[PDB]
Design a protein around this ligand. Structure first.
Ligand code: ZN
Ligand code: ZN
Ligand code: ZN
Ligand code: ZN
Lengths: 791, 791
DNA sequence: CTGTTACGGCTCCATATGGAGCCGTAACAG
DNA sequence: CTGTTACGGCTCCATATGGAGCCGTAACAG
């Protein structure tokens, strides 16, 4: 009725816990990273609600949506349909923009049709219908095409065509025999240079024969057939239109340009003649949300116009107010939804959900406050509480103190992670958790544990990285200086351009200069001080592997030492074994039946592929003869089965393994097991693995680390550990640059660069620079204002 | 909040109506057929709720579910997600049965794992996993295959292979050249008879070469290639497994047989050794729902077993009780869900929804009481009220008096249909509608209008249709006699076998004997009295056309007369025109640009095909020169634009057109227009069109009409009109047999055949026979008991 | 004029190879 | 012993023609 009773929850590492979540209330789930709160929420409640709603729909719709796996839960009662909002974005299609996603373009079209004065039909203003879409660009506004300068950057035999699937290097490839047939038809030499080729022949080859029929001969068996040359450009365009990695690869060689006729207006030349208050539809859509709302509020109409357009104006004002209160007062209604970050997309989805007014729906949010400045926390909390107040329930998974102080109910898991977590430690109001003596969240909220402000701060040693003439996006031609050898943190409000300035300019230029990559840096003049750097490393939450053949033991490189010490035993020496025998990636020591994968594929008549453990090897991925070899009473499979904490004690007598295992333990991965597949690892686990690998390396003092919000989905203890690890890395001799919005991390940094003073058009500048104490003295700085009370 | 406010509803024929539907209440929508209530419910509320829930899901899930069209409504507030339940069934896959659909097989597996005594793992009892599925049948229980007796029912050149896609009649077809290559390889003559062919050669041809590689030569251009013969049977099996019309066609030639090892148990020989109370899993699943519930209630366990299996037993008992209270006390848990009727599937879905306990969801049901006997009305109403009471709202679209008397709120549309309906006439409680003087439902509920019991009933003239030895399904070898020349109605409780006995036996045998069709009748001895019949006609709600080239004017045949009178004018005579010129199906009088379709196809870069009216012809489907010809001030397009009611007055001077138009008016289609596409017609409109076509024919007195519940989705006035039409058809000279569950239709019949006395195993017999007055005197008959008070 | 049958024409639905990232191994320099 | 570079091998992901039903037309019988 008024509760969500869950019994027998055993998904992932949950230790058969029973919980009662009050309905129509603000509920937050807390715990350490990997403690199972994310599993308990998403894999149980969201999955059960989505399955219960989908299975009751039409058969075709259910088949299209797929067959969701049934969670390992006894029974759940009082479960309304669940909608999950998380930081995930897709390119999707160019047809969708911010206005269409937020469902305000329809209201704008209705208003323009009803009251717009021509210089009147709602479908005339839409670019998704032939009645309004521009004839040339088909309502897209961007004539995407592949320029000839990129297809042929040398004769054909030297590798002129760099496009995938058109490599004429192979003699028997389709491209080779098509080129041979074309050369036979047009009587030209393939080995002739492209520049020396006649323009007509080159144009015919590039753009095809335009439907002309030619004879093509193919040899395996021999035969002949009649067909036509489609052309490289036409085939690439058709492949692009047929269907995200392939889309990104195709768009890499593309050259986006504005439509020559509509100039990106996406509409016919006659639809733009209708204006409201001196601004047509495109000009209104080009304004930022705040100024558009101000213009709508200040708009003056006659009595008849006000009576005929009251409801549309009220709806537009309400939606714009919701969007502003969410925090996106800098975005434009005409901006493409594809070029949006995860936090911006999540906030837009939240605003749309608030505007829709759906009732009786369980809402689950995964860290809505990440990627958002501290000044917008109150607005975000007010929006969340309004969404709850409209007749819904919230299951936010957050680790922010303000969220705990604003939430009605708090559920805490733990007390550790992995095999030590998965059970509820404490629950109730914030006061009850604060008074609870066995809760980590209560301990960190009551002041028992805290992050201390360092007494001594490092200073630059005379090495600086100067970026000159940065003008990409909203950057107003600013020059910044990043000291080398100290912990540098870059702050600023959302949309100020810090993320672009770092990721798409500094990292790309450093990679091109040092790692010898092939990327296009952002619009800037030059970078000074690169000679002081030897390598650039970027650490993110991307998975460390896409195959089941990768595990942390191999990634950290400790598996080589483990195999060496295994082969150094007397049994392997007497049996003539090698260090490579104890590996599930090379034939000789792996199971032959399962090919070392450990699972087998079974095909059903009317079901997808089902995987079961291999019968002969029992999932140990090794043959019996190899497994007979034991080192100190444990075989290779048992060693792979140990966790990092146990491996620390087991391998304490071998320094070369002990150092790596201790690094893995210190980066907070003491609950993980060496045999875990890299595919099953989460973002935090992958980031910790990368940090451990970086720590295990021998630093030369000329390395730069770039991190983009490393505190995503991290508890207070995790933040403390990450701060300690970053300080250790800085003290090693390298330099660390972090884009952070967390005050706890910010206050421990040695240098702070602030970008503001606003977001969007008003941003792109530099407000404050120096140590946090110096930045706190700047009056016109939000970060300084917050650090004034934080310190 | 507590209301669903809809403003500006203009979908289909709705005349801009505003309504307020109370939330969490029993609401019923009433109106005439075609008045727009179905549109107002499904196209507006269900569509808006489904779109609002889908658009907030993941991008991939939203793309898979498709892009739902936005309804033509201003705004809807307080809209919870909507689930629509309607009478629609699909073959789907053999993996799903009644138990799996109702989610009781999982609980049965859990109970068997926990307390079953072997002679213990939940996944061992499931047939959807390799751990429990039978190795031979792969957990299907039916080895579906194509028998050789059906592939070759004459030499190859005479058409031995009757399978689609393997017609060797064409010389250049792939089948022909494959057969030629096989004949060249094996050195045999294709023209040789199949019987005279060696068994080895025939087996090799039928089952392929089993991977053997042979040389195949093909001619258009000439060439050769190496491949293997897959075989007809293997190719057909692969095509069947690749992917409903094609599935039905493939299954027509299939021969379903039980698995030789498991005997249809779908499980391994070891999983059936576990028994509970002397019955294993398959034997429990083979019992009917009522007796299974009785067995579970009477089951005795020890204290430990009761303590360990209390929750599972309680859940199973509750679900079985819900299923029994729904009305399906005769179904078996092991029955395949594919072989279920629309009403049974809808009731099963309702029971599953009740068991799931989803809260805050709007439920829309389309005639849940159709196909259900009168004795189950109270149980169905109680189930609906319980489903509402668990915290939901109901939007049932029903025309049953008991539903009106049980509903909290009633919304009435009308007052007519088509252009006369689409607006709300009255609303409120049942008393308010009864006291309303301008409501058709109130008029029929207050006794102002009623269907009178006929004073005189027709009697048989000595012609009878005797079915001897009917034994299909649950029929217990019964003999029935259907009189010819009178209105015969067949009644009985659900599951008594009347539907099978009629549709799959009598209609099929009559079609085979008279219409010279190719179908397999049900298991019966013979039928006597066929010599008194000349033709058999079956009328259902299936669409009358699948192309936009069919309209009621052509279907009824009146369009030929219209074209003839158009060509008989002086303008056509002077211009040398013919009767075929005024047709949008032959070149010469239709628009060349749109090819007479009236619409054009426009392709977008990243959108599906969009259809817009043709520019040159303005959607009139005719060229200008043809349109210049006018008859009595109206051209052909204007004539097509007229409705039946207007065409009745326009064509009153031509008897050959007036008779057909009057028939169309009398069958209740006075609101439809002659130019309406047959694809857009609903089931009721198609049935009315078929009835009008049958009436327009010249009856020879030797025709039999078979109707299966013609009162589906019909108001009381529609029922009265249909009864009048059926009586007119009977008085014409033919014989009508109707399977009906409506007491109003039953009381007007001349002969009644009752099948009972129960459903399932207890059915398949004949209880009462004779006139309704005679049937009402039978004590052990539910239909007689109801007719006792009805008459 | 009307019903039936046969034929022609139309429409909608159905049915294998190259590339990026990672692991293991050998060689060379510090 | 350790770091770096180069190479080989492995895996997962990506990119047109026959048939059923209907409409129009002509011929034959009542
Ligand atoms: Zn354009
Ligand atoms: Zn194996
Ligand atoms: Zn079997
Ligand atoms: Zn046209």
């Amino acid at each position: 009725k008024d509760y969500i009773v869950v019994k027998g929850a055993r998904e992932h590492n949950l230790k058969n816990i029973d919980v009662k979540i009050p309905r129509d209330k603000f509920v937050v789930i807390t715990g350490l990273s990997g403690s199972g709160k994310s599993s308990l929420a998403f894999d149980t409640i969201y999955a059960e609600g989505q399955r219960r709603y989908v299975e009751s729909l039409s058969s075709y719709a259910r088949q299209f949506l797929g067959q969701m796996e049934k969670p390992d839960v006894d029974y759940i009662d009082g479960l309304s349909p669940a909608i999950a909002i998380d930081q995930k974005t897709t390119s999707r299609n160019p047809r969708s923009t911010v206005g269409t996603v937020t469902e305000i373009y329809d209201y704008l079209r209705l208003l323009f049709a009803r009251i717009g004065t021509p210089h009147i039909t709602p479908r005339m203003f839409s670019f998704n219908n032939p009645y309004g879409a521009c004839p040339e660009c088909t309502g897209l506004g961007s004539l995407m095409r592949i320029d000839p300068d990129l297809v042929i950057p040398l004769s054909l035999a030297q590798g002129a065509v760099r496009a995938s699937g058109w490599n004429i290097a192979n003699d028997e490839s389709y491209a080779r025999m098509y080129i041979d047939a074309l050369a036979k038809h047009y009587n030209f030499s393939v080995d002739t240079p492209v520049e020396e080729l006649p323009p007509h022949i080159l144009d015919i080859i590039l753009y095809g024969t335009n439907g002309e029929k030619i004879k093509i001969e193919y040899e395996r068996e021999k035969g002949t057939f009649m067909a036509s040359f489609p052309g490289i450009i036409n085939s690439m365009e058709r492949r692009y239109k047929e269907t995200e990695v392939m889309k990104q690869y195709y768009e890499n060689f593309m050259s986006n340009i504005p439509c020559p006729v509509c100039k990106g207006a996406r509409l016919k030349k006659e639809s733009l003649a209708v204006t409201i208050g001196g601004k047509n539809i495109y000009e209104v859509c080009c304004l930022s949300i705040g100024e558009a709302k101000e213009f709508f509020a200040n708009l003056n109409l006659t009595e008849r116009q006000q009576l005929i357009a009251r409801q549309i104006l009220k709806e537009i004002n309400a939606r714009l107010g919701f969007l502003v209160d969410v925090g996106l007062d800098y975005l434009t209604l005409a901006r493409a939804a594809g070029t949006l970050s995860g936090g911006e997309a999540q906030r837009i989805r939240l605003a749309t959900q608030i505007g829709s007014g759906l009732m009786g729906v369980i809402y689950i949010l995964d860290e809505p406050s990440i990627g958002l400045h501290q000044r917008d926390n109150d607005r975000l909390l007010r929006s969340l509480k309004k969404l709850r107040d409209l007749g819904n329930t919230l299951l936010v998974v957050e680790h922010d103190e303000d969220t705990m102080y604003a939430s009605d109910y708090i559920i805490d898991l733990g007390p550790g992670a992995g095999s030590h977590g998965g059970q509820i430690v404490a629950e109730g109001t914030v006061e009850e958790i604060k008074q609870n003596p066995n809760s980590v969240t209560g301990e960190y909220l009551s002041g028992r544990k805290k992050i201390e402000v360092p007494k001594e701060r490092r200073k630059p040693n005379g090495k600086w990285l100067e970026i000159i003439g940065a003008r990409e996006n909203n950057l107003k031609n600013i020059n910044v200086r990043i000291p080398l050898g100290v912990f540098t943190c870059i702050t600023g409000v959302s949309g100020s351009g810090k993320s672009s300035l770092i990721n798409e300019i500094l990292y790309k230029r450093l990679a091109a200069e040092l790692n010898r990559a092939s990327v296009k840096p952002g619009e800037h003049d030059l970078i000074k001080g690169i000679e002081y750097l030897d390598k650039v490393i970027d650490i993110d939450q991307s998975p460390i592997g896409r195959t089941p053949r990768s595990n942390p033991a191999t990634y950290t490189g400790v598996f080589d030492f483990i195999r060496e010490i295994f082969a150094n035993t007397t049994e392997a020496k007497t049996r003539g074994y090698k260090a490579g025998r104890f590996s599930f990636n090379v034939k000789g020591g792996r199971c032959e039946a399962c090919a070392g994968d450990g699972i087998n594929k079974i095909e059903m008549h009317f079901l997808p592929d089902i995987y079961v453990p291999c019968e002969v090897c029992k999932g140990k991925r090794y043959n019996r003869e190899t497994l007979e070899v034991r080192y100190k009473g444990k075989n290779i499979a048992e060693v792979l089965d140990m966790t990092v904490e146990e491996a620390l004690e087991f391998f304490k007598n071998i320094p070369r393994i002990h150092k790596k295992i201790e690094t893995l333990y210190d980066v907070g991965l003491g609950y993980i097991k060496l045999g875990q597949s890299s595919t099953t690892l989460s973002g935090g686990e992958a980031q910790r693995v990368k940090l451990a690998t970086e720590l295990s390396r021998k630093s030369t003092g000329k390395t730069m680390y770039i991190l983009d919000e490393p505190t995503t989905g991290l508890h207070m203890a995790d933040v403390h550990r990450l701060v300690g690890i970053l300080h250790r890395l800085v003290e090693a001799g390298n330099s660390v640059v972090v884009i952070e919005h967390n005050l706890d991390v910010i206050k421990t940094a040695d240098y702070i660069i602030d970008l503001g003073p606003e977001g969007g058009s008003g941003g792109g500048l530099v407000v404050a620079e120096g140590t946090p104490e110096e930045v706190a003295k700047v009056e016109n700085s939000y970060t300084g204002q917050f650090l004034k009370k934080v310190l």
